[PDB]
Structures are given as C-alpha cells and as structure tokens.
Write an enzyme that holds these catalytic residues in place. Sequence first.
Site, short mmCIF file in Angstrom:
data_model
loop_
_atom_site.label_atom_id
_atom_site.label_comp_id
_atom_site.label_asym_id
_atom_site.label_seq_id
_atom_site.Cartn_x
_atom_site.Cartn_y
_atom_site.Cartn_z
N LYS A 43 0.85 -1.18 0.00
CA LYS A 43 0.00 0.00 0.00
C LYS A 43 0.90 1.25 0.00
O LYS A 43 0.44 2.36 -0.17
CB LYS A 43 -0.79 0.16 1.29
CG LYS A 43 -2.09 -0.47 1.61
CD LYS A 43 -2.14 -1.83 2.23
CE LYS A 43 -1.38 -2.08 3.51
NZ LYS A 43 -1.51 -1.02 4.54
N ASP A 150 6.51 -6.93 11.37
CA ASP A 150 5.77 -7.35 10.18
C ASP A 150 6.30 -8.67 9.66
O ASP A 150 6.41 -8.93 8.46
CB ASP A 150 5.72 -6.21 9.16
CG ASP A 150 4.65 -6.45 8.11
OD1 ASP A 150 3.69 -7.20 8.38
OD2 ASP A 150 4.84 -5.86 6.99
N1 LIG Z 1 15.44 -7.61 -1.56
C1 LIG Z 1 14.42 -8.15 -2.21
N2 LIG Z 1 14.66 -9.19 -3.02
C2 LIG Z 1 13.64 -9.78 -3.72
N3 LIG Z 1 12.38 -9.45 -3.67
C3 LIG Z 1 12.15 -8.42 -2.84
C4 LIG Z 1 13.11 -7.74 -2.11
N4 LIG Z 1 12.63 -6.76 -1.38
C5 LIG Z 1 11.38 -6.82 -1.65
N5 LIG Z 1 10.97 -7.77 -2.53
C6 LIG Z 1 9.57 -8.00 -2.89
O1 LIG Z 1 8.80 -6.88 -2.65
C7 LIG Z 1 7.64 -7.24 -1.87
C8 LIG Z 1 7.15 -6.02 -1.17
O2 LIG Z 1 8.15 -5.12 -0.63
P1 LIG Z 1 8.37 -4.88 0.90
O3 LIG Z 1 9.75 -4.38 1.09
O4 LIG Z 1 8.02 -6.09 1.68
O5 LIG Z 1 7.14 -4.08 1.30
P2 LIG Z 1 6.21 -2.94 1.56
O6 LIG Z 1 6.07 -2.29 0.25
O7 LIG Z 1 6.80 -1.91 2.52
N6 LIG Z 1 5.01 -3.92 1.74
P3 LIG Z 1 4.30 -4.60 2.94
O8 LIG Z 1 4.75 -5.91 3.37
O9 LIG Z 1 2.80 -4.71 2.52
O10 LIG Z 1 4.26 -3.64 4.08
C9 LIG Z 1 8.11 -8.41 -1.01
O11 LIG Z 1 6.95 -9.03 -0.35
C10 LIG Z 1 8.97 -9.15 -2.03
O12 LIG Z 1 8.33 -10.07 -2.92
MG LIG Z 2 6.58 -6.24 2.80
MG LIG Z 3 6.06 -3.04 4.55
#
Ligand SMILES: Nc1ncnc2c1ncn2[C@@H]1O[C@H](COP(=O)(O)OP(=O)(O)NP(=O)(O)O)[C@@H](O)[C@H]1O
Ligand SMILES: [Mg+2]
Ligand SMILES: [Mg+2]
Length: 327
Positions: A43, A150
């Site tokens: 989000k 989280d």
């Molecule tokens: N270093 C990484 N390597 C590979 N895939 C990644 C990596 N970082 C993030 N992703 C992908 O990006 C998705 C979402 O980014 P993330 O950093 O978890 O979240 P956010 O945008 O802050 N989302 P959320 O979990 O809903 O709070 C993850 O659930 C992974 O599938």
């Molecule tokens: Mg995430």
């Molecule tokens: Mg997150």
Amino acid sequence: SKARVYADVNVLRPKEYWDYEALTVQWGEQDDYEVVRKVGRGKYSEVFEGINVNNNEKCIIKILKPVKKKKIKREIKILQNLCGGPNIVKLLDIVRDQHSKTPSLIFEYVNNTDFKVLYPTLTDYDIRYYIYELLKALDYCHSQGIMHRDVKPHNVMIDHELRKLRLIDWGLAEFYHPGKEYNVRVASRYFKGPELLVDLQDYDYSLDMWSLGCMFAGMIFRKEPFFYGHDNHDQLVKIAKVLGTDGLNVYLNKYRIELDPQLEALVGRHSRKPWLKFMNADNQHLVSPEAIDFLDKLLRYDHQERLTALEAMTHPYFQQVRAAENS
Ligand SMILES: Nc1ncnc2c1ncn2[C@@H]1O[C@H](COP(=O)(O)OP(=O)(O)NP(=O)(O)O)[C@@H](O)[C@H]1O
Ligand SMILES: [Mg+2]
Ligand SMILES: [Mg+2]
C-alpha cells in the site's frame, strides 16, 4: 509489561541511534539504478528488480509512495542500524527523483521463490534451517533494540538454491523503549499477536515471536495462513478456538484487560485443542514432538512466556542445523 531481554539497548545508546525523526538522508544518484521489472508492492510502495548501471549487478528498487516523512526516516534509520547483521536485507543506497523528490530505497537483490510455491516443496530439514536463519535475524534485530513488527512470509526472501535468507521490509519496524505504548495497527492480520488484538499497546520484541510461530505452524501443518480470520475481531476468535479461552482469561486478567463485549461474545468459550489435531496425511512427515514442543512455546497469549529469539535457536528442534553449522 516490559521486555525480558534487550530492554535497555536504546536506554544505554546515544539519542542519535534511535532518534530517527532527526535523520539526515545523504542522497545518492537516481540514475545509477534502472528499473527492469516489477516484483512486488505494498500500500506503501512499488518494488522492482533493478540493475546497478555502474557494475551491472541486480538490485532491488523500493519506490516509496507519499506518506508522512517520519515513516520514511524510520525505515531508513533502522536499515542503517541493522545493515551488516546476520540475514538482514542490505540497504545499498537512497535516491530521489529530482522533479517530484519521490524517494526510492535500493537494496541487494535476493532471487526469491514465492512462498506459496516454495514452502510446500520444503523438506522437514529445510524448514528447520530456514526458521533458524530467520531466527538469527530476529535475535540480531532485538539485540539492537528494534522490533520488526511485520514478520510474515512475504517479508522473508529466500534464495533456495543459495540457501540464503534475508529478513526484508523494515517499514513497520520500531525502536523498543521500556514502557512505550505503541500503535497496535502493525503486522499482517494472520500474524498479529494476541496483544495487538486485545489492545495491549506496551508490547515488545516478543510480538515478532508470535508472528514467527504463526509462520512455523503454517509450514509444519501445511496450512497458510494458520490463523485465518477475516478481520481483527475474527483473528482473535480464530486464535481463541485453538488455544482455548481459559488461557485467554488468565492472560487478560494478568495484564488487567477487559475486552470489548461484542468481541468478548464472538470469542465465547472454547476448549484448548491439542496441536496434533491438525496433523494429517500431507503434514505428518513434518509434525514431530520437537516441532510441536517448539511451536507450543512460541504460540502463547502471554508475550512474556514466549521464547526469546535467542532461546529459540537453542531449542533441540534445531540441533541438526546447529551441528551442520559447527562442522
Ligand atoms: N530484496 C528483495 N529481493 C527480492 N524481492 C524483494 C526484495 N525486497 C522486496 N521484494 C519484494 O517486494 C515485496 C514487497 O516489498 P516490501 O519491502 O516487503 O514491502 P512494503 O512495500 O513496505 N510492503 P508490505 O509488506 O505490505 O508492508 C516483497 O513481499 C517481495 O516479494
Ligand atoms: Mg513487505
Ligand atoms: Mg512493509
């Protein structure tokens, strides 16, 4: 309620360690990183596999959406505080778009296999190894005075071929301060511990252990998510149908908590269901006595009774992982 371990970390460290509203970002060059293909979102952001133009290696670009500026400083400061820790995703650079000043976080690239497809292929040993690796990151972040908040499978990247794990997504994380009331609107619904759902705000590093327990229960019982409630109230009812309501009442009265009466009526009265009643054909090659013993010490209402990340890594359940690590 106070943390039973690492309670004084921030207390004893300089204000700058934990004073993230005072962060001063030292921006990199937005052009060094190019977007190759979208891999995830929240989000809160858009996440792309990128390429570092200066050396050609894969990277991750987390393009942040407009949110209060404190929320962005927090996620960055935590990443800089943990950078280098066992299995902690590495934050490589911070860059913004000149025109809109849209901030992007650059991370190491993990070649992940989606958990809905990876988890079911995992052998019993691999489960043991990966939870052990994830425990190293959690013990490390707690020891540095930060709660993740989280813990869930989408925030755990695994390169199965390299047997490499990274605990990603420090966007909800926070610095632990003895006595602070924290917003309880954190973590994913399936992973929210009893204290978030009953509104006990002075929670600590143990919330991450409940979340880890829900992930573990999902893996050994082949059931994702293990506590499947449609909204918060229902999330506490799914918990109460497994753990029993006697335990909950013990718990509520220990911390002087009176539930909302509609909630209280949804919950009702449920006998504790032993763990083995979830054992079946598909999961019995994964449900032994040590798994159950370990799970049982993670999924407790009382956050104070739950194992710490350090205790968890020494549980007999992980003896073979430890021995393989030692030679
Ligand atoms: N270093 C990484 N390597 C590979 N895939 C990644 C990596 N970082 C993030 N992703 C992908 O990006 C998705 C979402 O980014 P993330 O950093 O978890 O979240 P956010 O945008 O802050 N989302 P959320 O979990 O809903 O709070 C993850 O659930 C992974 O599938
Ligand atoms: Mg995430
Ligand atoms: Mg997150």
